[PDB]
Each structure stands twice: as C-alpha cells, then as structure tokens.
Design a protein around this ligand. Structure first.
Ligand SMILES: NC(=O)[C@H]1CCC(=O)N(Cc2cccc3cc[nH]c23)C1
Ligand SMILES: [Zn+2]
Length: 139
C-alpha cells in the first residue's frame, strides 16, 4: 500500500483504490494502473520533472529503502493477476530489486522528488508506474 499527496490530489495504484477514491475520482487509467482522487487537506509531496534513471524506493516487504537504476517509461508486458488479465502496461519503469504484490504504492524518488510508485514485480524485478508526465498534478 501507499499513496502520493500533492496539492488537492491523492495518487494511488488503481487496483488498490477505495470507495472514497472512486466517489471523488479526478482521473484514472487502467493501462497505467493509476488513479487520482481529490482531497480536502493540502498535500506536500514534490513531484519530479526530469529524466533521471537513478533513485531510491521503499520496499515494505523488507522495511527498507533501496537505491536502483531504472529504465525510462515504456510499454511493458505484465503477466495476469486477480486485478487484470495479461496485458501491456504503459508508462512503466523496471529495475532489478525485490518486490512482492503488497509492496505496490511504495514511492520511488530521485534528487528532484517523486518519480512514481511500485506497481509490478517478480523474478527479481520491480516495476514503477511513472507520474513525472502528469504536469496537472502541480496546478
Ligand atoms: N498489473 C499490475 O500493475 C499489478 C496488479 C496487482 C499485482 O499483484 N501485480 C503483481 C505484482 C505486483 C507487484 C510486485 C509483484 C511481485 C510478484 N507479483 C507482483 C501486478
Ligand atoms: Zn530526477
């Protein structure tokens, strides 16, 4: 689990969104595994606007942060799960690192701020849903 809080927005994994996230829906994209809902309180997370390929992520299944090199956002094939059939997920970045399904929502950060959230994994890989192109989150 885990979310990003920026201004009047809350970003979560679309497969983990709540009834309240859906009742206050701003934008959702199944192909990206992302959902943004509105909040009354003002968020203080800083979103990165960059093309960094190094950063640090939080892995709840180890209670640790890990430094990683990751690929640029791309269309990657993601095996089936209880939430989606087998499909290509867009705007996904991969790195060699530990992850388990319960790690979804753990934040990836570079020196400029929040890059994305854990969304996929397996076979010693971890995938992050990018958020750096969502310029509207800041305004
Ligand atoms: N399609 C998706 O974006 C998600 C949907 C829910 C989900 O459990 N997964 C599989 C998964 C996620 C994170 C980490 C690992 C490790 C093994 N399986 C993992 C993929
Ligand atoms: Zn950066």
């Amino acid at each position: 689990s885990g979310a990003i809080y920026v201004g009047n927005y809350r970003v979560v994994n679309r497969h983990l969104a709540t009834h309240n996230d859906w009742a206050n829906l701003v934008w959702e994209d199944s192909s990206r595994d992302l959902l943004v809902s509105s909040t009354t309180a003002q968020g203080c997370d800083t979103i990165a606007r960059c093309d960094c390929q190094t950063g640090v992520y939080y892995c709840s299944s180890r209670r640790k942060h890990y430094p990683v090199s990751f690929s640029k956002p791309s269309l990657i094939f993601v095996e089936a799960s209880e939430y989606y059939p087998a499909r290509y997920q867009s705007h996904l970045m991969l790195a060699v690192g530990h992850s388990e399904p319960g790690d979804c929502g753990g934040i990836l950060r570079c020196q400029h701020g929040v890059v994305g959230i854990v969304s996929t994994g397996g076979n010693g890989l971890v995938g992050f849903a990018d958020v750096r192109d969502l310029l509207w989150l800041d305004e």
